[PDB]
Amino acid sequence: MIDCAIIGGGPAGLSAGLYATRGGVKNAVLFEKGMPGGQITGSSEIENYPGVKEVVSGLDFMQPWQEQCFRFGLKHEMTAVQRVSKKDSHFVILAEDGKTFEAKSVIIATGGSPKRTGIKGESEYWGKGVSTCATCDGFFYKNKEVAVLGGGDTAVEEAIYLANICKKVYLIHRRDGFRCAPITLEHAKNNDKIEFLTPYVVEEIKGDASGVSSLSIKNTATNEKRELVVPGFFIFVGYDVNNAVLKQEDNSMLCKCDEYGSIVVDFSMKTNVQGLFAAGDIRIFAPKQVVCAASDGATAALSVISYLEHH
Amino acid sequence: MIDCAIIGGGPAGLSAGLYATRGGVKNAVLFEKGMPGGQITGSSEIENYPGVKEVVSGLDFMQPWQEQCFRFGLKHEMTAVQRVSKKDSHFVILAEDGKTFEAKSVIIATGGSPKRTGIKGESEYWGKGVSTCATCDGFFYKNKEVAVLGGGDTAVEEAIYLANICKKVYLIHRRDGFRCAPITLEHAKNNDKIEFLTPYVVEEIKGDASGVSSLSIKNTATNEKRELVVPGFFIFVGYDVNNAVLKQEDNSMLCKCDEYGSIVVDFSMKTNVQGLFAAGDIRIFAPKQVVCAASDGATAALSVISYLEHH
Numbered sequence: 001m002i003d004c005a006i007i008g009g010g011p012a013g014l015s016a017g018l019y020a021t022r023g024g025v026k027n028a029v030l031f032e033k034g035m036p037g038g039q040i041t042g043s044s045e046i047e048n049y050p051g052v053k054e055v056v057s058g059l060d061f062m063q064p065w066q067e068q069c070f071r072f073g074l075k076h077e078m079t080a081v082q083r084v085s086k087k088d089s090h091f092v093i094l095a096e097d098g099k100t101f102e103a104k105s106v107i108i109a110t111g112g113s114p115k116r117t118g119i120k121g122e123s124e125y126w127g128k129g130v131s132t133c134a135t136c137d138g139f140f141y142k143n144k145e146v147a148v149l150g151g152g153d154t155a156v157e158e159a160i161y162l163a164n165i166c167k168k169v170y171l172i173h174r175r176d177g178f179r180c181a182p183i184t185l186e187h188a189k190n191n192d193k194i195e196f197l198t199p200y201v202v203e204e205i206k207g208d209a210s211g212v213s214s215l216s217i218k219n220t221a222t223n224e225k226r227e228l229v230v231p232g233f234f235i236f237v238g239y240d241v242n243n244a245v246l247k248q249e250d251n252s253m254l255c256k257c258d259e260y261g262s263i264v265v266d267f268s269m270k271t272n273v274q275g276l277f278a279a280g281d282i283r284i285f286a287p288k289q290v291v292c293a294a295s296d297g298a299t300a301a302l303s304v305i306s307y308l309e310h311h
Numbered sequence: 312m313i314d315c316a317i318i319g320g321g322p323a324g325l326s327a328g329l330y331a332t333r334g335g336v337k338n339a340v341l342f343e344k345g346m347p348g349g350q351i352t353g354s355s356e357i358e359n360y361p362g363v364k365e366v367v368s369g370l371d372f373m374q375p376w377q378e379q380c381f382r383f384g385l386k387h388e389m390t391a392v393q394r395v396s397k398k399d400s401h402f403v404i405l406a407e408d409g410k411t412f413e414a415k416s417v418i419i420a421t422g423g424s425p426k427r428t429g430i431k432g433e434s435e436y437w438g439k440g441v442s443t444c445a446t447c448d449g450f451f452y453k454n455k456e457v458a459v460l461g462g463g464d465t466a467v468e469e470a471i472y473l474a475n476i477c478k479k480v481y482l483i484h485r486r487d488g489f490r491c492a493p494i495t496l497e498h499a500k501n502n503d504k505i506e507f508l509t510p511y512v513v514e515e516i517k518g519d520a521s522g523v524s525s526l527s528i529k530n531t532a533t534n535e536k537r538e539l540v541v542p543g544f545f546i547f548v549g550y551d552v553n554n555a556v557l558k559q560e561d562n563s564m565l566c567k568c569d570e571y572g573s574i575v576v577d578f579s580m581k582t583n584v585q586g587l588f589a590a591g592d593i594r595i596f597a598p599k600q601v602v603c604a605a606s607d608g609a610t611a612a613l614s615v616i617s618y619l620e621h622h
């Protein structure tokens with residue numbers, strides 16, 4: 001059977017594959033439902049991966065990972081995994097096509113999904129002015145004006161963060177009330193670089209081939225419309241980790257997860273199930289950066305190597 | 312005063328500097344006693360950093376980090392730091408030459424130090440067949456023979472690791488007795504791909520332009536000398552994390568450390584001291600890889616950014 005099955009081919013899984021195979025794992029298989037690369041391939045520009053000097057698209061950034069991470073014997077399985085289960089001292093991987101695979105160890109590296117809005121223009125402008133990543137994309141708008149959408153802890157915290165980089169932040173939310181921590185709302189309210197736009201909705205994201213240039217917004221109470229001119233629009237309307245593969249036939253989870261469904265790991269990326277590891281945005285307290293996902297992947301692979309030595 | 316003082320300019324410190332400054336920290340200073348880059352600059356060949364497909368020396372690998380990590384305003388203070396201390400709500404950085412600097416937050420990124428033997432040829436062939444990093448360099452010797460020096464947990468564990476990649480591992484130690492865990496010695500003694508050479512000392516590491524080619528070894532019970540032909544020599548004769556800057560005037564330690572002196576951190580790279588973070592090989596459970604060190608630096612910088620917003 002497979003020595004290590006890696007579920008997901010974003011930076012976490014790719015790095016895990018590289019490390020596992022270069023660490024002597026003889027039969028490592030990367031399961032990935034599309035082309036490996038993960039979420040960054042949706043972005044028109046990345047500049048914050050340490051050691052990579054030139055600013056390029058996310059797709060171009062991930063291109064060299066394909067040859068490199070497979071250079072040491074990693075195998076690809078292009079399929080959507082439906083379920084990972086533990087059976088005796090190994091794992092059973094069920095694919096959506098009905099195929100089954102068996103593995104001695106497993107690294108879950110399935111990432112997560114920012115919640116989207118379906119606002120007109122969102123799909124076209126995703127990654128070219130529409131972002132869900134303030135750390136990744138904020139600095140591209142240094143001394144420029146941007147808008148933020150949402151009323152939770154993430155939206156308000158990120159508005160505050162962006163206010164220290166951008167000239168001005170328009171915080172757009174569909175009610176006068178917010179569900180973030182009152183203390184955080186207090187801080188945002190007292191920041192002169194944040195302009196609250198409530199109760200508002202965004203009706204259209206406008207731009208051209210080079211990206212976003214304006215938002216059509218509307219006051220929900222008065223129906224007054226306005227065209228807000230900004231090159232960056234940050235959407236923080238929620239988030240869900242991709243933990244579907246953990247769900248067992250009896251509805252339980254494969255391994256321990258937190259309140260939000262993220263996989264609990266220790267510093268070795270070990271779950272509470274022997275031979276099961278996790279890496280990247282799927283795990284608790286993940287920073288949601290490529291370098292961090294890749295580090296988790298490496299760490300999980302090193303833990304797999306140690307586990308397989310004794311098993 | 313300085314917003315964030317980053318102590319050490321290896322991949323952890325460099326990545327922290329990049330992230331801190333791209334996150335809007337206006338006055339971030341990287342304290343580094345030499346040229347930034349850290350331990351990888353001793354190696355002649357790196358291939359395992361996810362996303363960098365070219366195989367180049369460690370010095371060349373780190374060259375682009377110099378421009379990139381400083382592109383967003385980071386400053387470099389070229390000095391050896393003697394101590395980091397708390398002073399009311401900020402920190403004082405004391406240099407070995409007596410200069411002092413005040414900072415609002417600090418990231419400790421000082422790495423660690425493998426112990427050197429001083430054996431003839433060790434300096435000459437460092438990073439050219441002499442290594443202290445089995446993950447970094449092991450795979451270069453796939454299906455070749457290598458030697459490992461030392462008799463502790465690290466030497467014997469790494470001999471076992473290398474025996475799963477190499478054709479044969481010679482485990483050389485200056486006594487018949489080992490100080491590793493009993494079960495580890497048992498595993499190694501019963502591994503057919505490990506040959507014990509005890510009690511022996513290595514008198515010289517020999518090579519040519521291509522790197523290491525042989526060792527001169529002496530049996531110290533019989534005084535018999537002979538040549539051992541191997542292209543790779545791994546030295547594991549001890550290790551110390553670089554935690555000297557934590558030691559206070561009153562001999563107390565600045566923050567909580569583990570039994571080996573490594574800094575305790577949470578998943579946000581926070582120590583038990585407010586405004587003090589750590590990153591890289593200095594912190595507990597560090598995998599000792601550039602991508603991991605860089606991930607920690609990024610994470611610590613994100614925590615600095617949040618800290619400074621509230622302070």
Ligand SMILES: Cc1cc2nc3c(=O)[nH]c(=O)nc-3n(C[C@H](O)[C@H](O)[C@H](O)COP(=O)(O)OP(=O)(O)OC[C@H]3O[C@@H](n4cnc5c(N)ncnc54)[C@H](O)[C@@H]3O)c2cc1C
Nearest residue numbers: 008010011012033038039081111136280281288289290293
């Ligand atoms: C708009 C945008 C811009 C970004 N720009 C940057 C940036 O500038 N810098 C940066 O560091 N990061 C950037 N990122 C990437 C970000 O940091 C992510 O956090 C990172 O990609 C997470 O990596 P991961 O490997 O954990 O997960 P993901 O990237 O989500 O990868 C998971 C992979 O698993 C696959 N998968 C999931 N479920 C299954 C299944 N059941 N079976 C098979 N395959 C499965 C998915 O198809 C995907 O390829 C950006 C993200 C976005 C959305």
Ligand SMILES: Cc1cc2nc3c(=O)[nH]c(=O)nc-3n(C[C@H](O)[C@H](O)[C@H](O)COP(=O)(O)OP(=O)(O)OC[C@H]3O[C@@H](n4cnc5c(N)ncnc54)[C@H](O)[C@@H]3O)c2cc1C
Nearest residue numbers: 319320321322323344349350392422447591592599600601
């Ligand atoms: C032989 C060898 C080969 C390697 N090759 C690879 C490889 O192929 N792949 C890989 O991923 N990694 C490689 N590395 C690097 C390795 O991964 C290290 O674990 C990594 O460099 C740790 O990074 P760090 O930033 O935590 O610490 P370090 O790299 O140790 O950097 C710490 C920096 O802090 C400075 N510093 C320390 N104390 C002070 C002070 N008091 N004042 C001022 N400055 C200070 C030091 O001068 C140093 O530059 C190699 C290491 C070795 C020894």
Ligand SMILES: NC(=O)c1ccc[n+]([C@@H]2O[C@H](COP(=O)([O-])OP(=O)(O)OC[C@H]3O[C@@H](n4cnc5c(N)ncnc54)[C@H](OP(=O)(O)O)[C@@H]3O)[C@@H](O)[C@H]2O)c1
Nearest residue numbers: 116117150151152153154155174175178179236237238239
């Ligand atoms: N510091 C912390 O402890 C911390 C930090 C960040 C996140 N978290 C937690 O992590 C979880 C995630 O929260 P998070 O803010 O991502 O989001 P979360 O609280 O769900 O909030 C989502 C927000 O987006 C709004 N929204 C949803 N769909 C929308 C749409 N289609 N159009 C416009 N607005 C829309 C919601 O509006 P309504 O309010 O009108 O429904 C809500 O304000 C929460 O439990 C949060 O507390 C904690």
Ligand SMILES: NC(=O)c1ccc[n+]([C@@H]2O[C@H](COP(=O)([O-])OP(=O)(O)OC[C@H]3O[C@@H](n4cnc5c(N)ncnc54)[C@H](OP(=O)(O)O)[C@@H]3O)[C@@H](O)[C@H]2O)c1
Nearest residue numbers: 427428461462463464465466468485486490547548549550
């Ligand atoms: N799994 C784990 O928990 C784990 C894993 C790794 C390390 N550790 C711990 O980390 C600490 C460091 O261990 P480590 O093995 O790096 O080193 P360590 O225990 O100091 O052992 C060093 C070894 O190198 C030998 N040596 C020292 N100087 C030498 C020289 N100049 N020439 C030849 N041989 C020399 C020593 O010989 P002598 O024996 O003759 O003095 C000893 O066998 C230890 O506490 C170890 O237990 C724990």
